[model samples]
Target: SMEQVAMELRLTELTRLLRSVLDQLQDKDPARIFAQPVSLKEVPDYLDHIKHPMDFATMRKRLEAQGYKNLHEFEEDFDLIIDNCMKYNARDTVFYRAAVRLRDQGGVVLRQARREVDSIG
Candidate 1:
């Protein structure tokens, strides 16, 4: 179940990425400018500024580029968080809940974008 949830969370991330690309191409919104990819050395700064599920939608709307230059950036950021989770040995339920919340939020944003595009068309 943990893996299943993680996979779904990742899928949500993919959707977010796709939406970002579409936004860029349509030139309807500025792209989000994500922080650079994560490294062990950059963990502190990454944690300092990285968007969480609660802030995902707001950040998505405000950032023109979405900050992530590519899928690797997204994966690296995610892995960093997952690594921290493992280091802390976080509770599975808590992790799953967080993932689910993030996925739901991202899904909502994606859905909203789709509706807006449809309306314009």
Candidate 2:
């Protein structure tokens, strides 16, 4: 029972940490660009440039399905979300600015998480 509870705790912790980042992403994305999957018809060239696109809805599903095994895995998905936006949008565009800000805020969340877990164990 001890080992069983420990394993469940690990997944619970990871889910909580990942959801924190997701919450930030949602609040910062006012235009809702990162909220759902990109439509190819609306932006046909998006797929051509971004090989691996990511969105908040997809991230939510991943969390629900236990697709992430660790914090780094969740971070990688978050990175892809920002990276794709930056790669596709122009340097001076609003999308790029949002992506940059999201990157900064996401980093802060991750750092906070590290400190939290480190302080205890």
Candidate 3:
């Protein structure tokens, strides 16, 4: 629950940043609108990586894993991911997904602890 709340806040902050960047890009490169169409599947993967801080090497690894051969080529358009997320209210999705992921991860630990406690009985 806490993680979900943090994720939503992060997404909101990201949306604001994206809007600012897109506004700047609109003036500099009118042809490059940040709200261009994106496929549904790409949205979650894109959000997961960009939402966190990473070193250059890790960033490159992430980009490559995402099937991006040239990260720089897409750098300018990266904020578009945020743009779409905000526009579509995908913040809710982000919150739900983070909650689910955290719950799943925590569940394993919880189960192990339960088993250990039961052994004392």
Candidate 4:
């Protein structure tokens, strides 16, 4: 019983930290492009370049569903969100640069999450 309880409590803490990371990333996107999924019709061949397309809404849903068992899994999804953007768009494009900015800003939030998670343990 103690082991199960401890796991539940730890999961709760991990979920909160993941939510904060996602929330900060959503806020950092001024263009709101990352808020939802990319349009296949609008940008043909998007799936051709990016195998795993990720977005804030999808990550939010996954977090709520308890799909991630650990912080590293959550971070992987966040990385996909940024990496997909950079991969699909060219270096000089605004979309690529915005994703870069998000990567830069989101790094601090990620570090904060790591420290907080460690403190909880």
User: Which one is best on TM-score?
Assistant: 4
Model 3 gets an lDDT of 0.40
- The top-ranked prediction according to lDDT is 4
List model 1 lDDT by residue over 2-111, tens digit each.
99897666556655655664444323212221222334374556455545422234334433444554444444443443344444334566644444444444445545
Candidate 4, 5-117: lDDT as tens digits: 98998887788778877788788997997888998898788888889999989999999987888888988988998899888889999989999999999888888887887
Q: Model 4: how far is 20 from its true place, Å? A: 1.8
Instruction: Write one digit per residue (lDDT tens) for candidate 3, span 23-96.
Output: 44334323322324433376656544344322223333443344332223333234333333354445467533
Determine which window of 10 residues in candidate 2 has minimal summed lDDT. 112-121
RMSD of 1: 14.1
For model 1, state the Cα shift of residue 69 in Å. 13
Worst 10 residues of 1 by lDDT: 28-37
**True-structure lDDT of candidate 4:** 0.87
State the weakest 10-residue window (summed lDDT) of model 3.
Answer: 52-61
TM-score of model 1 relative to the true fold?
A: 0.29
lDDT of 1 at 43: 59
How much is the lDDT of residue 12 in candidate 4? 78
How much is the lDDT of residue 3 in candidate 4? Answer: 100
